[PDB]
Subunit: 308 residues, 6 copies
């Protein structure tokens, strides 16, 4: 009844998930035309099946999105019983409001495209904004890396009991206070004005910058300096989504981080070869278990505070 | 061509809006059956007209929402050219995410009810969260009290140039850092572990608590005490949406606030007689201008 | 697979139904904010389940409706397999047409709100107008109190074989002729012009006023007088939905009714303490059985002429 | 700017409407393939125009409905600004509820087909049931023959001031009590147990049978006999929608009716030559005025 | 779980399909009013069932379509689990584009009516244009008579290995080249300008005109003459949908066809009595098997190249 | 009132269109994040305006489609009166059917994305298949290069009166027979069994290969060889949509084409310097006229 498919050929995460569920990834004949159009053919019947499409870790966001939409459509019109999009890193998630400008809410457009392509269910991890669940009328399960983060901290940072959890911006406050409260430690916040201001005590403590994602790493790198100047003993960065585009890998190599921790929601293997500071938390088990629970009608909510 | 209607009994804001636009409120017979059902009867033709329904402030959120939905529907099925809901304080705005709970996203439900009722356009002020705009497929104009708040701060707080804008909670961080930046002053934040924790400096300076809304005022009143303990000269409370229900009005007086500043997005006339430190910023001009500009194809962004 | 939830704390009907199905009502953390906003939290997983939400008997129609919509939404986005609204008394049912005025069809708006909240199915009893089923695109089962009414009449009115079934208005004709034909008796009709006119013979017969609902009871009370003046031996009123708001309980106490019979679609316990003329027909079994049949894929139509 | 098109072959009503509005009917090539498929080809641009399609009276209900849906779609995809279906007699109106059966609500299906075809507005007359308006989310204007029926009664029945308005069935109760009230006369009702039963007084007075529609006229003809047996002076039959199919025309002559009055919502010209007691009320002026008023943002309620 | 219903009283195909599945057709009380309105009543419960409605072979396209829509609606609001329209010959399929005129895309309107009536799935055979599948958002299975055609040819035309497959028009090229390639033979094409032009060699070969449908047969009859004049040994016509309206049966009787082969997607029994040249390929097994596979979640795609 | 915006970087067509209409392109800041996400910011009010977005030609089909969808959405939620997508070459047009495969109908998906993004109207040229219009419920105007192709044939091929219009494949049959009919010349068709097969006569006459589009040009180049082998005097290739990616430009030169004629629905300026036999037909005037006529309620059919 269960059927798992991958996007593109960045199948590492997809294969890890399929492995954990005891399944082979479904056959897809999936190539890009000479004119950059993606052609897809589902190589097996999906009729009456519970289909899960895991979005590729390829960097080109528009290619990845279109491929996903196309595969959703193909499965729907081939009479799949249900089609679930498994989207570890939600595309255009940072474009979720107008911010006083004549801007698109591109995340709402993305949710609309997934809905009209025929998605019945979304599984995602750490949406940049939780309100994005409201952009759909279909159910969304928004998984958290938090339990895996708390675990990583307790086992890797000796001074975790006396550390400060630090938000790199104003929008991350609720997220760091939540980790701070669970660990029973302090929190601090950095706000960029072309200067950063820090509120909260980090003096003579380990500082852990926690964000949902880092892209060019300009922010986390400057925040690390700022934290050291404020007297933090050393600085960690823990992000769920490691985009690391453009100059990021250069910035990290030169930055005063003790370690930069990311999940494998985005493929990190190439980036790790050029950046020794990077460590990866595997989230394939969380994703596999959410898929398993979804299919069985069991509680996905268990995964919100517990690591499977 | 333009027609403005009001919700149930709270006419003050609606009448202020209509006055500024040179218009009388549209005729509507609005009431309640002995069995609590809302009756509404548009008392004039709205065929081919640009209709604006300004949501009532009877305080009872479900009655007010149902009355608005019913008026939208009646206008739509009476062949209005367009219907805009003008909703200064968006119902259920706080319920805009699951929060790790098996909870409704009631703000999205409310957006869907408005859309299915036939609204073509929404005008609102200081949405608890900006993503609520994305809960609709119809255009939403989200007005800001911010410019009127900053004006009031400068014109009423002598020591404003060196004060600190303070958030009652972790979630209000963005709102206070925006205000503090435009003033070029400092910010601080309070978090409830319970015990309250303060990050940032307020010592020997005026503290201004800024929130989008206050309900029971439990948080804002406890916040004010912590601020005083940390050596704030005087403490102010600025709220765009002043609901002030329950113990709120008494809690305010029993608190140290030099003043509690709210907008008239919700009626305050009753709560001002019972609380002397409350001051009101009139936003009827911001809303009238939004309607006029919406009607005329003119830029509403200017009001931001 | 089956899960029953109640609205508010007027859980009598809900508990009766749950009892009959051998179930406990599902856990809900359901409170009203200081600012009259209803906050709801489903206390157990509904993932993959057949959910039934029974609307509260609390009098405040807008609070009750909103609570119901909110619970439907919560269950839908929590991945319930199906969500059925069980709405014994359909709100705003009397606002189902324009009546030559610039009026809302509020019942159509209500049906639209239930549909967008995510209802897949409605179970209701004696819709004021059967056309209201057409206000939905989802299936509606409209149950009838008629079989329970016919039963009540045969067992409580000795002269049932020679009685007259009387409509209190023009809109109730089809409903009374139907009861009249089944009992093989006469029917009559009252029409209010500020005076009532009666067509049909009631002289020296027991008269039974049958309506779908009574609210302030102005109409049924005046109809009872009118029937006695026409020479009816005595008068009964049988309504399915007993709203009894405002002066109703005063009007009934002073009216010349032998008995006023209602169902428990709306809670009557408080109203009975102040009004001895009221008797209640329990419809929990009809509702429980429709829920049971719905869930099993069995015939709900059996209940249209038969009392379970 | 306004453009009026007609259905297949029944042009009389459509042409009457267009004449009153000072307009020629729009060019359309409408036919049927040898294999019964409806072909339609709008013969002029309707881009940016206010288009009114008046439904045809070829009698064949499914052909007429499909032709209307196709014309609506063609106008919509040719970028008409707005499309109104003008449907004097709403197809499948009688099928508006399940009636305790595993039955379709075909009137709702018809409403959905119209909506999906692209209709923005409906104009109709004497909907079998008023709730049918709620089967749509688009505006519906439901016109009344009532004022024209009352005029005709007074102007044609000498003894009208003391007559009785009678319903052929239990379901027509509201329709007859409304007419009887405005005239300040009595009403009565017939119900089929079969044997027919009469409630109300008709003795030594003129009886007027009033229904929204009559098909085979079995009910209305049997009703007329019962009324005569109960001592009605003379019996009239008033029907807004006169379908008169099958044995109806013969059954009418073979019956006692002093007259059978219908509107021209359905063509009657053929059925008037075969039945002399039939009289027609022209409703083209009511419909033209509704279109003109719909077009101009003027009050259609006035016509009620 | 499976339930099959027919439209009207042209139940031959429907009965054949029901037979092959081991089922009796469901009870329907289905009559036309004196005013040409179709009244329908489903005589048994369809609650929770997998419903298949097979569209009648009656000639009156609008009556047939409306009846089908009405039955779909009736089953949907009676809480069928799924409703599938089985439409062997898709109505208004030839009206699937604007053709430079101010024309309706009537096939898109038809697909929209089926969707709003509540169809969850369509089963059809040889859509005039495959793009018509794109007119729906629900899944469409478009079955092919091709495997049954190839079989008929191999067993009935001795010279099949040296024949020419001929398109009667420009729009049929892809269809004939496909049959030609599978049989490993030649293809040709006729194009009407008031004259026909033929491209491709048919000299001294058997010619097989293959089209999706024939209506008045003006085209195929003229094409047959043209093919004989070009030196074809003899001419066959194989259509999937035999409408044969108006003068068709007269035209065929006088035309130089060796045989005219059609499927029973449309009833042919009456037409065969007046036209001896007509032979019928039974497609009830293909339809029955697609229904069986649909219901079971098995591969319908097997039927695209294989005859069951 | 009318406002014209362009996609990312391909401005040439958009600027040609705006020039012909007497308009400057609307201000928009359009770019790409380091992480490939499309950023778009409408730089002026479009409230109450008739907005036309002309799709960009950066070649990367998914980037171009996403940028278009985002611009449509931004214009819609900024209260544009109407949004038209002007898409000379419809993305994924070739994927308009399953073709017996478990395949997407990606053209329908694309139509749905455009519709959900908020497009009210589409203008496009030479849809690969005419049924693609039915993939929408909004109006689509499908313009033709045909009249401009026929003009070019007569004005550039001396021996056109006795030439043969040839299809590269079985599917292009209708397109070539239409062209051949209007010219009153012959047609032929090529099919790939592989070995290529030719039906129809091309001996000692000029052969014109006509397709709606060519990508790698593998088919069209192999077609040209077969035509020469069959004794065609000279061979031309006419394509409304010239994608010309990969080996195409080299394959063309290495082929026998006297000329390869395309429209500028896709930029060609780079591919003309690298290939001398390419000629371009400007279609900016056809598209400008369609926008102007769409805006003014005038007949676009005239351009067909």
């Amino acid at each position: 009844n269960i059927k798992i498919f991958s996007g593109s050929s960045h199948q590492d995460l997809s294969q890890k998930i399929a492995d954990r569920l005891g399944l082979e990834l479904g056959k897809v004949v999936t190539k890009k035309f000479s004119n950059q159009e993606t052609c897809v053919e589902i190589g097996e019947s999906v009729r009456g099946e519970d289909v899960y499409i895991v979005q590729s870790g390829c960097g080109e966001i528009n290619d990845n999105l279109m491929e996903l939409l196309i595969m959703i459509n193909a499965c729907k019109i081939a009479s799949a019983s249900r089609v679930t999009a498994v989207i570890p890193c939600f595309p255009y998630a940072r474009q979720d409001k107008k911010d006083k400008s004549r801007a698109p809410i591109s995340a709402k457009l993305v949710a609309n495209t997934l809905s009209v392509a025929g998605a019945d269910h979304i599984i995602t991890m750490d949406l940049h904004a939780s309100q994005i669940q409201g952009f759909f009328d279909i159910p969304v399960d928004n998984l958290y890396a938090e339990p895996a983060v708390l675990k990583w901290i307790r086992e890797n940072i000796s001074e975790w009991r006396n550390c400060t959890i630090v938000s790199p911006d104003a929008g991350g406050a609720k997220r760091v206070t939540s980790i701070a409260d669970r660990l029973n430690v302090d929190f601090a916040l950095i706000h960029k004005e072309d200067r950063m201001v820090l509120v909260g005590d980090v003096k003579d403590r380990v500082a852990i910058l926690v964000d949902d994602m880092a892209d060019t790493c300009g922010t986390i790198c400057h925040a690390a300096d700022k934290l050291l100047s404020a007297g933090a003993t050393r600085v960690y960065a823990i992000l769920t989504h490691g985009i690391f585009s453009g100059p990021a890998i250069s910035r990290i190599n030169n930055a005063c981080f003790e370690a930069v921790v990311v999940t494998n929601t985005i493929p990190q293997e190439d980036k790790m070869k050029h950046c020794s500071k990077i460590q990866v938390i595997d989230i394939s088990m969380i994703l596999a278990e959410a898929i398993r629970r979804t299919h069985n009608g069991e509680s996905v909510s268990y995964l919100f505070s517990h690591v499977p």
